[PDB]
Amino acid sequence: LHKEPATLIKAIDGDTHKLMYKGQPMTFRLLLVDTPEFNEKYGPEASAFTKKMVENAKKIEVEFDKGQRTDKYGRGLAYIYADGKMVNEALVRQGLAKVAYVYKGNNTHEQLLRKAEAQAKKEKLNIWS
Numbered sequence: 001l002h003k004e005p006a007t008l009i010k011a012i013d014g015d016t017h018k019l020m021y022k023g024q025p026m027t028f029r030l031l032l033v034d035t036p037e038f039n040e041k042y043g044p045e046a047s048a049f050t051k052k053m054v055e056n057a058k059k060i061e062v063e064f065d066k067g068q069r070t071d072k073y074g075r076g077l078a079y080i081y082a083d084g085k086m087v088n089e090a091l092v093r094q095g096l097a098k099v100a101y102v103y104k105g106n107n108t109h110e111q112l113l114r115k116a117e118a119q120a121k122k123e124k125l126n127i128w129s
């Protein structure tokens with residue numbers, strides 16, 4: 001896999017945000033994770049965590065996996081990095097998303113994420129409390 005540039009347009013929630021990629025606005029949905037919806041327990045904390053991590057970054061990048069790049073709602077499907085740090089991983093490490101939605105042929109980072117989830121669980125962080 002490889003990273004490509006993007007810029008932030010607007011935060012949305014824990015696992016979606018609007019980015020400009022190849023100069024077009026697109027809503028991205030983070031691969032391999034599920035944050036709670038805003039109206040659910042830990043939803044607001046997830047949305048805050050993602051918003052802060054991406055808004056504070058000097059460099060946002062998008063990394064597609066090997067399979068489909070957009071979902072049935074038109075959302076980009078990627079791993080997002082903020083100053084080289086993956087958001088998807090960081091959310092799971094902090095117990096603010098579950099590993100989820102692991103579809104064959106878009107699961108390159110599955111084991112990396114599962115490892116974070118294990119540590120978040122060991123620590124009883126957030127969702128796992």
Ligand SMILES: Cc1cn([C@H]2C[C@H](OP(=O)(O)O)[C@@H](COP(=O)(O)O)O2)c(=O)[nH]c1=O
Nearest residue numbers: 029030031032033034071072077101103106
């Ligand atoms: C993360 C991801 C979600 N989706 C679809 C599955 C779910 O469909 P349904 O809407 O039919 O439940 C939906 C969940 O995303 P959200 O967690 O954003 O709702 O997005 C994919 O198709 N591919 C993916 O990689």
Ligand SMILES: [Ca+2]
Nearest residue numbers: 034035036037
């Ligand atoms: Ca969600």
